[PDB]
Symmetry: C3
Subunit: 157 residues, 3 copies
């Protein structure tokens, strides 16, 4: 005769640029894309903070700049482009200034627990990045299909 | 006959010693003004913390002392004097130890976004002040009538 | 006849390993005792953080290790041993990463307010302990029967 068979599959753990736990976090609205496009799991620099109006003009991280926060994942604000989710010019952003988020990584080795995070020129985590941050790792280290992700603990500037 | 007219006026943004945003903030009660009077928009110092009872004895900032927090604005707990709001000797006082608040300042130029806040010998922000804090600027820079205000970001000691 | 009399007595302020105030605190679950037993009012160390599962392996402080948090009193997750409340091996811990807690101290002198906290080898507060922490004192200094307690303010790593 025949022997019946059963299969089992486990879902992934996380997707790029999404929150990790329900710990204390502080997301910031009232942020505008001054120029260009911002990926969901990437660092963000502040070009200028308005005095009277109060909006903060943000931009993608570049060389010789201090990171401020990381964009997060939302199904309403984000625009569908480049086979992913991005924030377009002249639109609001949800930037996380504190908490734990799943970032994008160009690294190939698992990190430690309480070491400082280093970012490269385009705002993605790298083992030997030139840009130094005050954030620390959190322990999470997984990947989604062909995309590598890492968990990072952010602190307020 | 006649041409009708319509006018337009705008309200101010903030008042001295007023909470700026709804971000993560911590307000510490159970504090007593040991001596003197404390203005609403000024920093304070902790003279002594009681071991058993637990009331912290606060005082207006002086020379060579570490600031602790900024008094906040309340219509019930504050007495009116010198055409301003103050906290009198004795009685509870609300001091903010974390969050965004508007502070009195004697500076005349706009401050940068991320930079350490320096205060003078009486607790008002000054660009070339002597006392150095761990707080950082937030971006707000306005003026109510003839009073100059500035927004700062506080951190727990 | 007789003269009637009335008496009065007072309670104790705190018990070891219990939360002091309702300020901004963050209690992290998802922790398991890797080896040994952990007291309620003692610090812990992070042996290893799992990359995929997410649980953090915790232990007792030793020589040369950096503290992470302080165990938290509870009436359900803690067993009673040595006529005291204690966490056992292979069980969930309620480690407090930020906030105010009543620790165990072997010092004999009252501390200051803003000075840094030094711990000893076994993870209890000591006036001249070798291990250096980023935490700061709060002010509480009491004694329950024959056990000395001290209040401390914690910060996220």
């Amino acid at each position: 005769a025949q022997i019946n068979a059963s299969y089992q599959r486990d879902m992934a753990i996380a997707l790029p640029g999404m929150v990790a736990d329900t710990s204390k976090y502080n997301i910031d609205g009232a942020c505008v894309v001054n120029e260009g496009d911002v990926l969901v799991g990437a660092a963000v620099q502040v070009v200028q903070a308005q005095a009277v109006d109060g909006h903060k003009l943000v931009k993608a991280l570049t060389t010789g700049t201090t990171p401020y926060g990381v964009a997060i994942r939302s199904h309403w604000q984000t625009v569908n482009a480049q086979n992913q989710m991005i924030y377009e010019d002249g639109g609001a952003i949800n930037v996380m200034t504190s908490g734990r988020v799943w970032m994008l990584s160009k690294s190939t080795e698992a990190p430690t627990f309480g070491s400082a995070v280093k970012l490269d020129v385009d705002g993605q985590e790298k083992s030997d990045g030139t840009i130094e941050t005050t954030w620390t790792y959190a322990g999470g280290w997984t990947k989604y299909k062909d995309i590598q992700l890492v968990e990072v603990q952010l602190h307020q500037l």
